[PDB]
Amino acid sequence: VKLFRASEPILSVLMWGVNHTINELSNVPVPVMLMPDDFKAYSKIKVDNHLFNKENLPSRFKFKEYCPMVFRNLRERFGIDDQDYQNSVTRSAPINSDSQGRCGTRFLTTYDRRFVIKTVSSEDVAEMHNILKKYHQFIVECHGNTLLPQFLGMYRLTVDGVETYMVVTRNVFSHRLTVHRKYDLKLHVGEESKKNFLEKLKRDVEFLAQLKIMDYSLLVGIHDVDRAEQEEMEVEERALSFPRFFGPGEFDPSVDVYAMKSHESSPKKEVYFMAIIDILTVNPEQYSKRFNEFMSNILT
Amino acid sequence: KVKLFRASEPILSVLMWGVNHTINELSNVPVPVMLMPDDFKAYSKIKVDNHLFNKENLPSRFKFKEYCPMVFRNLRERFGIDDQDYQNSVTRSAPINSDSQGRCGTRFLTTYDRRFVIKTVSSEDVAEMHNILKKYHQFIVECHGNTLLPQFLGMYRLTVDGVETYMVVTRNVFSHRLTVHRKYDLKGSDFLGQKLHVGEESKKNFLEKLKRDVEFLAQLKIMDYSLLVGIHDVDRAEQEEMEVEERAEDEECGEFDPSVDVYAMKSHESSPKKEVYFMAIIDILTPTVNPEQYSKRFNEFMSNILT
Ligand SMILES: CN1C(=O)[C@@H](CC2CCCC2)N(C2CCCC2)c2nc(Nc3cc(Cl)c(O)c(Cl)c3)ncc21
């Protein structure tokens, strides 16, 4: 029984909007392939209830969903279940998170830290449409394995004649390990991690070049295990259907897809998280090349 | 899993989509302990403007409005209809055209499973309903859902291709399985001799139901309603419909549940031939004496018809 119980009313509208459009999609069948007209598509919905269901939702609001068919397919390709994405958005009010880039304004996270909700400009929205078909293709050929943002949906909400644009992505950071430090650059890991990380980075940057984009940056979160233990102990005494277990330096790489463990032969044990950040808002191929040079040598 | 709202007419696709939409929405709103006065002036409204999305059965652009979602939701449960079951009858497969009748020969739909009746109505009928709803609701509580009156279940306004339709949803007076051979619409003062013979509990139960119903229509200042009588003939159905269900299920392309067919009555255990009867008060809206006398005139005549 989903009261879209939230702090801001715009947040309630987001929850209701995601719930509706996801339910709505469950009655559309999955095509063999997407069509050119799926990249020009949307669904708009105007709600004007009166003296009904006003307890949490505004009585009047609009919710537009850009290219629903495309983002369903991206979700599939990032391995995100539509019922799962719907539950993270709707079981509980999304919550204010810190920051993951200079991108837009308000930063939010689903109550279970799985997905990141950014508020974006209208100009950002346009750039997304510009790039969406070549992005989609890029995700197809890399089997959804990128350091690029992993776009999951894109929405326009209107409450009280104000339009807000939101973009939903996969969290760069663990939805369960806290990030103690972040770095935004415009470090010793396993040789497998290192080889794989450089492989993604080479393609991701090259695609960003062929799409004539510069000025994106690498975001780096660092989780300190020893610290997480000390801070576990510190709040201890002051107090997955069942709870998943996990050891100390530990995560699920199907879930926390940007995460790397620090090499075993290395002092204090740590989880890193590195993503390419701010794809929206030297020539680009030159910037590509210099970006490849730099973030390469951060790692051993 | 999967509701592609396919139907002959877009208006019907839209009805199916909207019933699905509104019943879902309601599942996320708690059943209050009592309806407030403001629930009776309440509505849900929704405008869909899809573009190059979800276009195969549904129109790109349409509007759907539900009058009094809480009230009707309540009535539905007072009538022992599960919202879940109600959604299925409308959404599983398209509602269909009817066997059909009226006074100007009215055109109505049935849910694919013949369990519910949908009837296009006028702007003025919607208003009539609103005028009577609060009292209608009060009445439904006081007899615990036991009436011959239309069991009203939903009230909608669809708009497609710039045209607004009003529709009302009701329990079917007739069985969803047994065929009705004979229809009669007793419009006040085919029987006047042809008597109708039923069990004692059935006969006393019918009479007291009738008695409060007409009283209720009187204490609302309503007249010109009629008694809709359907007869299903058991022997005839055995003759005509012997190998029909089986031959539907091939190579090429007298009992009932009282819980479902609520207006039904078996013919008396020692009676000419085996029959099932269906009586209800019909035409309560707007599709010389006074209403409190028309009441007496109705209870008199419809009493005399059962022995
Ligand atoms: C309670 N109720 C009615 O009030 C109306 C439809 C109303 C809907 C709101 C105003 C009109 N009616 C009637 C429909 C036209 C007006 C009276 C009904 N017909 C049936 N089932 C039925 C009736 C006939 Cl006559 C029939 O041949 C078949 Cl197959 C099913 N069951 C119930 C009703």
Side-chain angles (χ1 to χ4, degrees), chain A residues 1-47 49-53 56-59 61-75 77-82 84-101 104-105 107-122 124-126 128-185 187-191 193-194 196-198 200-201 203-211 213-228 230-231 235 237 239 242-263 266-267 270-281 283-284 286-287 291-292 295-297 299-300, chain B residues 2-5 7-40 42-43 45-48 50-54 56-91 93-98 100 102 105 108-113 115-118 120-127 129-176 178-186 188-189 191-193 196-200 202 205-220 222-238 240 243-244 246-248 250 254 256-268 271-273 275-287 289-291 294-295 298-299 301-304 306-307:
Chain A
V1 176
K2 299 174 211 133
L3 334 178
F4 304 97
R5 208 163 58 75
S7 41
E8 261 201 286
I10 199 201
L11 300 185
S12 296
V13 163
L14 178 61
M15 303 170 70
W16 181 104
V18 165
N19 184 52
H20 178 76
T21 63
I22 288 285
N23 291 160
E24 201 93 301
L25 272 161
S26 83
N27 307 300
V28 3
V30 187
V32 239
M33 18 137 273
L34 295 163
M35 294 268 51
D37 276 8
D38 294 342
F39 298 87
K40 306 152 158 284
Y42 53 92
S43 53
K44 270 157 78 82
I45 192 143
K46 185 163 123 64
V47 178
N49 295 328
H50 185 230
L51 322 156
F52 164 79
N53 200 16
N56 294 285
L57 296 153
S59 277
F61 55 93
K62 293 170 223 139
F63 192 88
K64 165 180 202 153
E65 177 197 26
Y66 302 101
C67 312
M69 294 298 280
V70 186
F71 300 97
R72 201 219 251 144
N73 173 253
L74 290 165
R75 274 179 247 125
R77 289 170 202 277
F78 303 121
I80 285 151
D81 212 74
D82 269 27
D84 289 338
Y85 173 83
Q86 185 188 227
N87 281 302
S88 292
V89 181
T90 71
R91 269 170 167 169
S92 208
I95 43 140
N96 296 289
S97 216
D98 260 355
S99 193
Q100 297 174 23
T105 47
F107 260 94
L108 282 135
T109 188
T110 52
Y111 80 97
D112 67 355
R113 290 201 286 113
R114 287 200 203 238
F115 314 106
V116 158
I117 306 132
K118 256 190 263 155
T119 301
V120 299
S121 82
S122 236
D124 296 328
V125 174
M128 187 74 56
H129 277 139
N130 287 139
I131 67 149
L132 188 56
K133 208 192 295 189
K134 279 141 140 204
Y135 175 77
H136 173 263
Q137 195 224 299
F138 177 77
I139 294 311
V140 172
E141 70 172 67
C142 83
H143 306 107
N145 291 117
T146 32
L147 310 164
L148 302 179
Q150 285 177 24
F151 300 126
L152 308 179
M154 188 173 215
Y155 317 95
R156 192 195 71 200
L157 300 64
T158 131
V159 204
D160 284 304
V162 227
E163 298 168 337
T164 315
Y165 301 97
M166 305 187 137
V167 168
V168 179
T169 48
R170 202 208 292 283
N171 204 347
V172 175
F173 304 147
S174 185
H175 79 86
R176 56 164 273 280
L177 318 157
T178 54
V179 204
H180 308 301
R181 309 172 259 139
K182 315 178 270 151
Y183 306 81
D184 184 13
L185 341 163
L187 225 333
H188 303 259
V189 286
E191 207 67 284
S193 319
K194 210 260 217 203
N196 186 233
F197 171 89
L198 297 180
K200 301 184 198 156
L201 176 65
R203 23 183 182 74
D204 302 335
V205 134
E206 182 38 46
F207 163 78
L208 280 171
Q210 41 154 307
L211 218 60
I213 297 165
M214 284 161 288
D215 306 316
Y216 48 92
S217 33
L218 197 88
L219 205 226
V220 180
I222 299 160
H223 173 70
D224 181 8
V225 182
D226 317 287
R227 175 155 172 187
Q230 333 277 220
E231 275 161 31
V235 185
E237 90 294 301
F242 21 121
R244 268 184 80 185
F245 164 44
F246 299 100
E250 288 193 19
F251 54 96
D252 191 323
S254 82
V255 185
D256 296 335
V257 318
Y258 293 100
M260 287 142 72
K261 258 174 299 163
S262 51
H263 200 278
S266 234
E270 290 176 324
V271 190
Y272 312 119
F273 306 85
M274 325 187 169
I276 298 168
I277 237 70
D278 202 59
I279 269 180
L280 327 144
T281 328
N283 70 281
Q286 265 181 118
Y287 186 101
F291 199 101
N292 231 317
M295 326 311 156
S296 181
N297 299 263
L299 288 186
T300 338
Chain B
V2 171
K3 293 163 203 205
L4 298 156
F5 304 95
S8 53
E9 296 165 45
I11 146 166
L12 295 172
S13 299
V14 174
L15 170 61
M16 296 175 73
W17 183 93
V19 183
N20 187 77
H21 175 77
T22 61
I23 249 65
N24 285 349
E25 227 49 64
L26 280 181
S27 74
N28 301 147
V29 19
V31 192
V33 293
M34 50 151 312
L35 309 165
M36 290 307 293
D38 25 320
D39 290 328
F40 288 89
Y43 64 87
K45 203 197 161 228
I46 196 112
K47 192 175 104 60
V48 167
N50 293 343
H51 174 66
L52 316 165
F53 169 74
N54 208 214
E56 280 165 25
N57 301 303
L58 276 168
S60 273
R61 311 171 86 263
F62 61 91
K63 297 158 169 170
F64 197 85
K65 169 162 180 174
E66 171 166 41
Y67 301 96
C68 303
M70 309 285 265
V71 178
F72 284 97
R73 185 224 263 176
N74 203 281
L75 296 158
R76 257 185 258 117
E77 106 193 43
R78 297 218 178 274
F79 292 137
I81 294 141
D82 222 81
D83 268 43
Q84 197 78 57
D85 298 325
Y86 177 74
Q87 178 178 31
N88 301 300
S89 303
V90 194
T91 68
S93 156
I96 58 172
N97 306 284
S98 207
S100 157
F108 69 98
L109 306 139
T110 238
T111 42
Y112 82 101
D113 63 9
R115 217 179 283 250
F116 302 121
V117 161
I118 312 154
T120 273
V121 292
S122 73
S123 209
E124 14 277 290
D125 287 308
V126 178
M129 179 80 86
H130 271 155
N131 282 114
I132 76 161
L133 195 46
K134 199 151 179 168
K135 266 145 169 178
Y136 174 81
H137 191 280
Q138 196 71 284
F139 188 72
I140 290 320
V141 192
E142 75 177 62
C143 64
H144 314 94
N146 256 77
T147 36
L148 312 167
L149 290 180
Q151 294 177 22
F152 285 124
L153 304 185
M155 203 186 205
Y156 306 106
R157 194 203 55 198
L158 300 56
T159 119
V160 196
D161 318 331
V163 185
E164 311 204 309
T165 309
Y166 306 78
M167 316 196 106
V168 171
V169 186
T170 47
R171 205 191 270 280
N172 207 340
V173 177
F174 293 166
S175 167
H176 71 284
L178 315 163
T179 56
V180 182
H181 301 297
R182 295 196 275 123
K183 282 148 196 196
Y184 310 97
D185 176 69
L186 313 182
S189 61
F191 287 88
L192 98 173
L196 239 243
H197 221 289
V198 279
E200 289 281 75
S202 255
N205 171 277
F206 183 84
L207 278 162
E208 269 48 78
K209 245 195 270 140
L210 189 70
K211 205 152 77 167
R212 36 176 147 96
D213 286 343
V214 206
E215 197 191 303
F216 171 74
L217 294 157
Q219 74 196 171
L220 242 88
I222 266 164
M223 50 194 273
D224 307 314
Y225 49 84
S226 58
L227 190 81
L228 201 246
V229 186
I231 302 148
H232 164 258
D233 171 355
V234 178
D235 309 284
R236 163 106 161 270
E238 262 42 61
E240 296 186 339
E243 299 209 306
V244 175
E246 88 99 338
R247 289 243 209 106
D250 87 338
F256 58 92
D257 192 10
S259 229
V260 175
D261 305 327
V262 316
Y263 301 99
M265 340 210 255
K266 308 185 180 275
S267 65
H268 176 254
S271 208
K273 51 189 213 164
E275 269 170 6
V276 191
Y277 308 133
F278 303 91
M279 282 127 302
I281 291 154
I282 228 145
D283 172 43
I284 215 184
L285 312 159
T286 312
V289 222
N290 63 109
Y294 192 85
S295 181
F298 212 96
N299 198 226
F301 197 73
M302 314 315 159
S303 168
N304 305 347
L306 300 189
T307 49

